[model samples]
Target chain A: AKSPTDIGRNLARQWQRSSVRLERLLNPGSWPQSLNIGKPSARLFTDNIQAVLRHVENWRSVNVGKVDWEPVPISLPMRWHLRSPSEWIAASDDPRVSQEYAQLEYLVEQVDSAFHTLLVAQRSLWLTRTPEEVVATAQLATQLAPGCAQGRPLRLLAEHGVDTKFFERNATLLTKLLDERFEGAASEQGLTTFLDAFEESSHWVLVVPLQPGLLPFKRLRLTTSELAETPLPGSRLLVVENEQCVHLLPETLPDTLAVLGAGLDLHWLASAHLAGKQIGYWGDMDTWGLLMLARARLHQPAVEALLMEQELFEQHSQGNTVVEPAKALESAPPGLLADEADFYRYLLVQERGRLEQEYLPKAQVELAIRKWAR
Target chain B: AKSPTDIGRNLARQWQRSSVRLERLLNPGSWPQSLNIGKPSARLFTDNIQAVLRHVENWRSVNVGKVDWEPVPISLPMRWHLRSPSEWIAASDDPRVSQEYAQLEYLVEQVDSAFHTLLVAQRSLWLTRTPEEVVATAQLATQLAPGCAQGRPLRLLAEHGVDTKFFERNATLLTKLLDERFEGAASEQGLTTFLDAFEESSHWVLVVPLQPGLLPFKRLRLTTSELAETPLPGSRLLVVENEQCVHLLPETLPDTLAVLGAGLDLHWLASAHLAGKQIGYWGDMDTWGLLMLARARLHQPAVEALLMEQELFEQHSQALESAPPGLLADEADFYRYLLVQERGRLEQEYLPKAQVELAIRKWAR
Candidate 1:
């Protein structure tokens, strides 16, 4: 309970008057305190007397910043505080001093960041910058995330033999913050963020819930056949938002038709479009059609425009006096936007650059809806 | 070697012809110009069927700052150069992004720093600023430099233990710099400066290099029976420093006056001194002397001090004007720094504090 100043004072007092100074108190026959009578000798008179006895400097008031022992070192006598020096007095471990150790440590940290990155972005890829790529992988292994992608199956796939560093570099900053935020819970995001880089791939690629483990990848080797092989018990198709003058269907459909992610595996639907699926779709007959079509075809290809011919657009052009589509980027090709697909996608570009199927007439909407579904 | 602007310009020129955008050129995509021509159908426009090939945006010239490739889309389309909706897009990791990577990358950087810390401070203990105690144990282990005392030997005698944190607390700033410097070499002058804190005990002490292998404790135990049973071969008495002085010696010792490496062993000398032989002495002017003298007295109490007395100091006072000893701190009754039989200690405190302890061991008679 003593103040720092008080403790320091007490130690200074005790240290200045210790047994080591006891020799000065005694009156030896020396001439300093001349005419000395009966005072004892100042020196230890004996040859083998132990000198470093109870250290007077080691007092109680200052317990060396004492949490427990109250007599701090400032309180303790110098005679009492005898100790050897150590390595901190020497040097510490630094990589500039040991490049090998530095490199070793770096490798370990990379692995940790990579694992954490994958665990935070795998749900409903559309919400992310890339949707189709994630949906394709998640269908085979979709782990449902409540209130996010409703009933949308998702899976997390971890691929090794693929270099994980390139992905980790981008995520390093985010990973560090995560590490600090979740110190003890390093593995909550999947793998512990502080893995020894040298610890090999067996320590690599841990799969986690898709909504929790979506990161970026450099190359994807997914093939059409592989996706199609996975059976969808109640497979169905759901297409929307493409207003073109065409529609086709297969006879004796075993299942109903709905929109993407309706009930069947979106991966298979993507694969089918890539694998020549029947062309059937409907959307706005407007200026910004191409970008939407291209985006939809990112995973699925055989998508056909429905009722989007120039004549149909002209017929509907009466009351819906078109606004000149947003001026194209200065760098874009001059006449590219004039095309039929561009007009459709461009309308989407105008309606915040999106092409929803709502632009079609109510009758057309009903017919398309009825024709596509079972 | 080129400037950032130069590299950027080079890249702009390469991909501009294809309308592919410089950044996107790094990825797999058919140039937009190739598609615009002849209204080419999507089926015929594969990435390989490009109209104009240009030596632009190669890895060497591409930006490397965003090199992290895995799990993230590592490639940025050239179209993204002017209009990448997501700023995260990039061509590939190239040296061009080195500065960017450093600014943006925190996790990898921390790893680098921690790694470097390990390398520079090789094999030393890591510690915090404030320690809870007087001594630090891990620090104690590493102070074993040459001519050092008070390492394991003195600690074993004095009973000392402290963790690394506390040790660093004593000399926090120095330890930090040292933790970073990480060099194992010590300068003789630096050590001499360090020696000033201790009571000076080097007037008569000499530096003796003993054979490396044998330690004191092992040697004393060897001749314990001989010491306890009977007298020794030579006519001599052991002037021990203290009971602890001989107690911690090795099990045995050489039969000759030529001692082994840093010898604390007295067993051989013990019996030799027991036969009424005269062994002269000197020791630490502190309680630690109890052990030093006791070690020699294990041979015989008859052992005399080489110059271990107030009278001796007074008699030699004219020549020994240097004997203006300071006040002792522990109120110890029987210790002074008048060296007569000082044998083989160079100087006090010159040795490293890491030797299981600090404060070097001065020789005894």
Candidate 2:
């Protein structure tokens, strides 16, 4: 009786809980499949979470070295969930994947990394890990929940120690990562430093690579490897994401404006543009605005949103967040929306036949206001 | 399977034979739910006066009063055949037709028509005499090889004996009939006089009473008296008899054309027209032409068909008179087409497609 929506939501909730449970038993990405962390629920539902935990529980003990029709075991959860035996044979056909590695891993994403078809958000998938490594990853997941009894970030090391060999090889990257995640608390980069001095490590770096094909990867694929090292612009960059407003603007002015309608990402946006330009962005006055602005800031120091003051919000707040008169018949996933206002206005126009932004205060006003402020 | 054209010829031929068979029996016509003579058939056939005589191969009595219905009395020989029992009754419904006469004649044109309907030249149709009557108007159809028949006026009166009521009523009408038919007949009034005599003592007279649904009885009935009158003029006349030629005449034609296209009679034509102005008259080229021209001369004199000329015949001789094309297809019964050139043509083109639609589409329409 479950609808696609209901099933999807349940899958998401369970994935997060299972990831935590899996982490409690395994190392950070020490296992083959990745785990997902989904939305906060009023109360954790064991039914949903336990569903994911069951797969991880069996997978941790699944014998990887034992030979069967399958030879190589899967490397990631995304790979484990969907790859079929035929794919195992097909993979063996390709020289890139050795025949010895194909029997099991060929059908498994962790082994071949081509098995992922979809993914739950914030979930971590695992691939190619031994039983001990799986135990390490699951134990960590259980220990990371913000409100779980044993999930405070500090409790993770006590439960499952870090992988020393991986820490040694990527010491500098690990250190920088640690600094970024936990801030100034990272004292060293080895397993000893991780277990003993890592409590103060402000940059909590955790990496768990997923199975081959399943994805939270609707948008991302590692197509480019060159680092986007553009420095943050002169303290702040004002970026406008409205197409009409962006296109209508003079290019001679400050930053790059991605007029990607209301809710789409212009992440095709180059950091070079933000390198010397201070980011100042504006959109509807709603919670989504804060989340996007905050997320953008997390990556670039100069990035800041514009015209999102409390005063402006109250002014449009009367009917600002327009409730649709009729239900929105369809919509992309929540993240597909650019801003709260984008979702609101689309609802009104599609369901109620009202046109908004067109009726927003006219011509060069926002620009003039910014200029005057400068 | 028979081809479409073959089927058309067959059905048309059957129509003619059926009328002849009905005619010879002297029992033509309907009881309420009886037979439909118009039903289409697959092959050409015939019903002669002898067939009526052979209604039973060997019979005893020759009397009408005591004839047994067991043999299913066949039709007498006669000209023209009405389609059904209802039509026979309707034809006799006119107040002008005395009940006794209508009942008797209705039976003649219906049941008794089969024998005449079968005749190839329609010659045996005029036989309606007591044993005492003369061979006065008895016509016999004969086939001549070629040259001799065309070279001279034929001496054509031998079927009916020399003593009869028709011979006595108007000997001059008879004498002139024979003379004009043999002599160089006036192309204009010749056909009119022929029909006048042919249907002279008979009951039908053709006329355009100029009203619809106001039939002397009801709508759609014909009697011999209607042969006497001229048709009216208009475009939408139900000229099923000569549809194409009549269609060629304009509704708003100059008042000089007597738009007669044959079939039905004066009463039926008027009832069909109600107030609309269209005329329909029917007969052969020779007889109908004269009667039509005379009727026009009587009412709308200038209305003339100007048909029939030696030149037209000479031109159209290539399309020599053909075998009788069947009875229902008898709209072309007494008619012949004269080809001014080498191309042969028939009256088939002038008829409505509905006439043989039953074969093509399996519906009377």
Candidate 3:
């Protein structure tokens, strides 16, 4: 016969490590997604659910009905943990155990509802038929299952166990599914056709012309299809990766179009009609920026990089360089100039960090642009 | 025979195509340094000299002693281009030809001085010296010969010549030179001592304690030697790259040190004495951050990253996530938890700024 204090302290010990604080339940980000609630005992892991079970198991051990007296309050909230006042009231031989029982029941049932809808949504997701339709349904599922915001439903994918990266992996899985579906629909299609189809649906490409004085207007907004369809009015095209850097360019260049090349698969620009004209890309002096240049040139072979130069980087990089992570490429990406590739190769050998387009001062960007334009 | 007018037109055409804009000479960044001047006529490539030659070549074609006529102005700047007033005066029988000669003479002399200093510096560079001494000498040379600022005066090296990657190649050459000098001096020394010597000379590492309240002070400043010699007071060390972000941390942490990991090689952190203590690195969520974490772990294997969770990036990524460029990694950096490489791999700059105070608060030791 242990005292009520002993039983109370034991419950506190288990709750501490379990991470099932009531505040977290109220703090929606902690448990945003539903779980496989009613699965077998072995297939289990959850802070709140485990917390509930531990509370009940302790009550059963004590056979609290025989305590024959009102016990101290457990200090836990009664509203979220309890099913009803009486489920604890009618059962509490020692009033403390009843309060504990109510807290346990409240949390357990919350888990019960959490899993109930997800399993249903998971089943309904398969019946939806199309990837787009399934994704639409999943996005709506965020109200009950916030995890669905990342991608379409996949219940027990091995690598994607219930965790934070579920959303990222879900995107990968969704892409694969979409690709398979598209391929099933179309046979023997060139990349031109596939790209055209993808570009129509995707919002990856956005263009804003910087040098617009010799123009009909100040800015020209363009999508991939629109960019491909419209003939380039200027002879020299300046491609920039960051939109914020557009204002740094000279207004009204003669026969020049400064393009905001944010998210452009510039390979299409090779097939683009700006042949015999000067093509230039300006981006960060990072691995991805260089890679973007190389890959874009796979389609547009004659492109030259603008301000993304080694001398520029060396001069500007004082306190600006970030030692963040990078994966080195085995060979330089295609379309880089001999000097550009040399610089890219240097960064690879060093596993160098990045220099953002925004880091260079407006004056330097302007000077380089004007000189290159000439 | 080419007419004097044809000579003037040809010179102007050469000047035009060569892009020898007078404004460029005034612009220091346009062509910062001198090259090997007068290196056998065939060994050189320059706009000013060639333009000067073309103008004079035209004058030589119509060497007319019989006609007492004045020539048209070449329209080229005389100060930087002409060799001397007399060279132009002597060549020009008439007072009019004297003006053209003066312009040509002024430019020619300018090239002479430009090459004179480079050839001097080039010879000076080859003296009895280690690679480090030569680089030190070269650094001095940049003050006199600004063009040497580009590279170590050789374009034939594999990494140097062909690619536009001269700066990148310069670092490699510098490292090789430093290593060779070190090896030559340190006779039979172990890699350990060699690394230590290098670390002491390099100015990359700086440390700032994040959790200072646990100790006597609110912040600690340390160089590598200071860090190595002094016992780390805080058991929980939070390493951050950007110093500004360190201010975002809570004012006090028990038994903790929030270190500003600015310019740290991180590989040295592995050898640090804060062994068995919690080591956490906080940085921008970009690719460089992950790379930093990985490189740091190479020396300090037990480091954990704080507030670099995917959940933080996602929830806070509303106005935050800028559409930035990133390449996927084949393998995750060492010590990162599953999916962290994919998630934390995006840059912190891409994440909207000032969520740090909120993000830092969430990461208590």
Candidate 4:
């Protein structure tokens, strides 16, 4: 026995829950649908006869959806039968249906006018256009070009009346759209990494020659792409995790080239130039370093650990140790030798468990590199 | 005997070089100035007599600045002597001066329309108003509250037609004005720090009690302000540089409390609650760690360094050494003991010479 206001609220809620509104807007075939209003109980009809009469009269006033009704017997002296609302059948050509669509469109416009305007202009082509096309033509314009300068692209590209503010706001949406277009090409890689793949080479790797006259230059800075293209002159390659550790390398090692600043881009280990090379990987003794060693082995299975051993940890596990900020993994990551795995597990339980690569004595470092070269 | 084109180009150059234009716009007493366009040379008057006449005619054509002229003796058939140009004096009420002002104003508008519009609306109050006042009223509005949440201030405050874009663009100008008003208060501190000083307590410090019943909770995270206000239950306080080093602390100690994540803000060491507390500072055995130890001693003179000794470094530096990215200072910074200073110097020349505090074993750590 709901009042006219209560019934109106219920109808509005039902309309919101039903997919008929959106389906009708999105597809032409979904129109002329029926919405169930449910028949009122006989108790509601008997107790509140005046209320039922008013509810029927209120719904009849609107010439929108066709309201189906059924006649019910009533105990009134006059032969007046009570009719209850059964269902509402909305037609495609109904004016009220168009009004609801416009209302939803207005709500969408309030949230994002650009998307609303785009949807209105290209209703059929809204979801058809690839994200790359949308990003190039609508979002970034001429600023997003391969091999262009990295900085100032957003501001320079923003001159086409598109605000630079929306790029960060809709990054996830744009990422999803791009993923859909490229068939999940950037699924695991973040938005930044995905975008960087299409842009100019910014990741720089430092290459230092350990042998005299190994190359034209004493040291060279090359991008990852350039690194893959450039040939290594030495058969023995030493990969140092940190760039600043270039000072730690010996003055000259026979047929050895020290590669510094490779930080996490271990895929270069599998480059054609590095094929059959005796690679010695050196990093900090902490969990992160061990994890990097494992990743390096994935690319080059013959890659061997230089100073990462249990004996080295025991020798330096005095006041040089500090707490590992965050362990790279709970257990020893794979690709570690039996001894290396045991050492990694030993470090986890210890209170102060980290040994930075920089803390090793210069004499020890030189001796180790010399042995590795031999 | 230059042409009118040469004179016009020279005048435009002079107009750009002169501070009188800005002074006239900024100050009331700088108007009614005079610009000198030196007297023509005698060689020029004799060599190009017609050219000199044209230059004078061009100056007379403009009904703006008053052109001054002086008669010169010439060896000509007719007794018509050459009257070379001397100087041009400009009046404040001249229409051409106002036109030049409007042109300069338009150029400024192209660069930053917000500033140009602001200058136009508040011409007199432009330089007079302090930066704090402008930031509160015109810039941040209700979002700059002292105790509010740290994030979303700029975007939330930008609803009042003032774009968040301009805040970053005009940060330098606003910083300069604020410096003038505050008397070089934030001269050394950067703009971010300067703004943070007036904002909420966002700097969080981790406090862990090494003794049972030392605190209401086993561990607590509190803002710096809250840490300053709350009284410590222990007499002994240990300051750990990195927050993750909390795992290194012993399960229990006699009347001790461990503090972590006091990265650069050592001023809290001088707080009243820490008065007479026996403080032990532990950090990584690198240049940065030693620098933090020195800074801690500055605030609390009696603050001691724990596990940061030369003997300890030697015992553990066999295979734990790594290269310091960059030394904190060329020489040992002040506030270090003689031995610590020697260790600091020894590290600079060593190829692999940095030992982290985490590398120490369970017993040594």
Candidate 5:
């Protein structure tokens, strides 16, 4: 006794779980027998098709995360009249059973076809692109982390939504496809496993070459060994802790290769096995800053600390400095200049303080690094 | 021949190392014949020992890290006259040399002794009470972390410095001593080792009993077993994420024990043979909060979440909520309250806050 609108609502409810295999709903052969929706009732004639059309029109609001592919079927022909009481067989019937009866049967046939058309159009976006195809599309979007193209559900293709299990299932396949097409074969992997390939011959170190017009590549994501093993156009390579500063560098300098993310692990730099470029370290002026300089020194002895001086600290101190907690300010880290040592000692005796590097303007910082090389 | 001033400067230089053995410099028998100061001049005829005095006075300006002991010797008798070419044997004709010779020698000796006395008085503060004595003094100042005193040098004691090695060395000894003094024997230890004992017994559960005068302790630091094992005056126990909020709690509630530090290590509460108190968990409305709540429920199936809601998040969300990194929010942890699950869903779509303002509950600070 339910109306066509009630049937449409029921069909919408059935589709609520957003099954991974949405194609089965559209393509009859691939459809699961359990989900079969058989014949429509006679009451679902032309006038009631509005309910089915209304539901199909509102499909975008269903809150489904993403859809992987689109379905090809838009509608179907209604041949149900042939299976219903055949109109032709009753053609030679009583004269009273006239054209009106035949026309009514035809009307039932048309409405059946309309419902099939409605179901097909409703499952319109059920198909998806292959994983390799997704990789090619994502490559042009972001400058980094492209292997994570499968950010959306594998069965659904929306933007920026993560489905961890889907990625786990498809990561190796995606990495292989990327390697074949992108020439990053053993060169890179997805973000989460990005470091796995980092242990290989090529460790990607992000460098922004400050000198302009020398190389067309403004920023080089070269392997550490390649960057270090190659000849340097600049006199010294400046390594900094923060990335924004690396991006903020004033271009077209005579001699500089600004490096970012060196604090994480210095091993790649140590492993690079190169010569010629002098390494200059500039970081926050704090106990931890000195600790990093000291840690970096265990590898690069000739490295010079730039612009981390007590005089500068006293000039720009916000006056509310936090202690380094432990061995961070216990004593002066070795290799400090005599004046630097004096400043470090003074900080420890009088509540160890940190003067973060970002407070200074980019031009002033750049000038100091530039002056060092000059 | 050397001037008394010259001899004094030499003695001052030797004392600069701050050796405890100053008497050996004055008493030759105990001094190895090896370090023998052999002779002195005829200027010993006198009262002019002021030059030597100036050098000892200036010793205060020298810099050293820390000194633990002072020197004792000052004046020496001219018994060195034995070592100084036997002056008494040649003393026959100068009867005028007299006991007057003895007295002149005494005068020189007296000033030398005065300089020695001056140095000892100046360096008196250098001697430190032993490290054990320092450890005891610090205990009277702070209730915890006594071993971290003299926090800088392990071998030498400074006013307030900590040497990492010193704490690493004495953490065990101090713990043992503390255990003996308090019945907390093996129940408590130093900071890092403090947790090891925590895993034992009941495990320290911070409970704030709600009924006024229901419990005598303002904050009960009891083990989980003790809380779960003993019958409580309170009916419900509230578990909170941050400890500071526990301090900020409004008082005199009729039946509750508010718990802190449970989010840090859920193990103690899990092992504690606790029962009776209805466990109500209140944590941040995030994926992590749900995870912790779910994890706690494994041991306490009756645990219920309080004040973790989705409606509150929607009211305050600035439209920028970050995803919890990794698989934390990818799915519900376990035993998530229906409301937590929704906010968690909202957190994935929306997010969670770190600052616990739920506890603050005020129109103004």
Candidate 6:
């Protein structure tokens, strides 16, 4: 027969193993009615009769779980009979009982707290709700109004009494919540891209008029959504990737507008305002730039590739060429002309394939803008 | 005789004008013993006789400034002489008198406050110190230990009870102060560049081991100073411009160490740890990249230019070439090859990882 302490220790190990399945432990339906600690064998009664009697006496004084006693007959030299424990059954119907068992076994403080915290958390849920529902409630609470004074997540969430990194930490959880709420109608793009759909006002685009009478303002900053709706006063649009290259644009290109720093936000090109306007894309001559160009073509299939031609790159490549840091696409992106696709494939094999827009001669840029304008 | 009210009005205007010159006004040496308010002319005495007597009566009741009177002969009908008023004197030896004059004139609240604040700031200076000396004291109080935990100027200066934009606002002033303090020994390359000289601990460089058993850690971040002093277990060093391209480096280049994101901090290339190391530089194919290469060559004359060739650029030029945004050098920076100089005269995200890896692999072989 196992000692009461040994039985308690075995029961504690059982409780510890069950504690790992926290969700199941919290569920009332999954709670085990009784956990078998250990059974007293007849061999033990024959081997150590005094120890067996002492163990039985010790278990008789125990108060935690039910212990079964059976009369077993054992014959060594003559017939002998003794009452021994068939098995010790620890109750696990209540989480509190499991906590008590762990405490009796001298479990680590953290394990005890873990059990306590889980029980408390289960109780704290007002309604019988799944963990996802709880997470959904918290995630929904952190949502702000569209264009609600954009700032870092820490500053934005500080007003809501949440952790400084709540947005970053719960990004995936929030994305899942959004998917469930929208019934899979929302795109499952990464969290940042998904969040952008709700913040239309945050998409700022730089618009600079290249000609004298192209627009009332010399330069204008507009949200992408606004840019899509608003009709600009120009017949030709030159989309420059980097905003730093705004100075490279011609001061006057007879009815031209240079939209700069658009990076990958080429969706604006699909707007009705761009229906008849001639669009030209100028960006870094690298894989990502080619990918951006392909994306731009998706919005405007007729978008012309200016200054990004191979000839200009050859003219300026001597000291100007350097290795492309990180290619945006492993293969040629869709929506490219045959020649453009070939160029993309060619760039994949050559080292120092990137030639930035900033290094292009100012005269070359002006010439390209003028050619595109006409 | 002029009325004290008129004299006070004149003194207030003079004080308001002098308030713009705060530095001079604060200097005791530039202080005037007495200021001339106005000179009462004989024409005024003849124009209004009763008003003149009342004005003299006003002067008698005045208490702020000294008003002078002189006997002048004025003939209205016949030869008649009477004592008429001369110019009024306002004492400007004390800035406090200027404040009182401004208050008496009912100066705008802001103007009054400005005068009051200037006087307070002047008096707060304990010594007969130049404005520069005063500035130097306040600036010296804001200095912290080098590499003593860098942050935005606001947070760094917050420990000393300084303004949020103290560094930005006083940048020019601080530059001048440094020039005077260092006796023109320090570079005057703008505030940011000049301040970088004092911040040796803030320069962080990313070091990645390209081959196995090259470094104890897979990736290590060390200050440029530490990287300069510590010798790596490698004979080849490939300096990449952008850190994001660390994955593009070959996984097992023999005896190769890739240093990513050094950017313009090529000064560490001068370290003795780089002695006899076959160094290769890879950066964006732009004016800035060429400029960085030139800077790298400045430290190590034999640094190889990897994958930065005109022929390679021509081969990949087709849809990959775009306009350069800004040129780093108006002309070729010193230390560039003849062909590189010609290329510098003509001046992202579009990087090709596969091509970069291929180039690195070829260079390793």
> Per-residue lDDT of A35-77 in model 5, one digit per residue for the tens?
2223333366356876544534444342212212233233321
For residue A90, model 1's alpha carbon misses the true position, in angstroms, by 30
Candidate 5, residues B1-365: lDDT per residue as tens digits? 33333443554454333232234334456432222333333374245566544434433332211112233233322212222212221222233333323433443353323233222322321122233533443352234433342222233332344444444444433333333233222222233333222233323545666666565334345554444444556566678775545534554454666777564345444534355446677766655566566666666777766555545654664411332222223223222333333333332212233333344232112
**Scoring each candidate complex against the real one, what DockQ results?**
0.01, 0.00, 0.01, 0.01, 0.00, 0.00
Candidate 6 lDDT, A99-171, residue by residue in tens? 4334332322322232333223223221223344444434353453332344333344335445433453344
For candidate 4 chain B, the 10 contiguous residues with the lowest summed lDDT are: B77-86
lDDT of 6 by residue, B203-309 (tens): 55667777766553354455666676656677888888877655556667888887787856677788876888888888776655765676687678878787666
Residue-level lDDT of model 1, residues B1-365, one tens digit each, is 23334444554444323223322323334232211101222453355333211222332354533322222112322222223312222332244333332322332233233223221222121222222221232233244333344322222321254333333243322222222222211211122222121112111111111223322111221123223443334333223332223322223233322122212444344443355554445443433343445555544546454334344333433212332232223212334343333321222212223431211122221
Candidate 6 stretches greater than 4 Å from native: A1-201, B1-365
Worst 10 residues of 5 chain B by lDDT: B77-86
Over A264-371, each residue of candidate 1 has an lDDT whose tens digit, in order, gives: 123345543235335344444434344344445554555555555555555654544545456433222333324554554434444343223444466655554456
C-alpha displacement of A207 in model 3, angstroms? Answer: 3.2
Which parts of model 1 have CA positions greater than 4 angstroms off? A1-4, A7-374, B2-64, B67-232, B237-263, B267-276, B282-291, B314-365
Give model 2 RMSD, 1 decimal: 54.8
**Cα lDDT for residue A274, model 4?**
76
Instruction: List native contact recovery per candidate, as a fraction of 1.
Output: 0.00, 0.00, 0.00, 0.00, 0.00, 0.00
TM-scores of all models? 0.21, 0.17, 0.28, 0.29, 0.28, 0.29
Chain B TM-score, candidates in order: 0.28, 0.23, 0.42, 0.39, 0.35, 0.43
Give the B-chain TM-score of model 6. 0.43
User: What docking grade does candidate 4 earn?
Assistant: incorrect
- Best-performing candidate as measured by TM-score: 6
Candidate 1 local Cα displacement, residue B84, angstroms:
23
Candidate 4 chain A: worst 10 consecutive residues by lDDT?
A76-85
Flag regions of model 5 displaced more than 4 Å.
Answer: A3-9, A12-203, A268-273, A319-331, A334-342, A347-352, B1-365
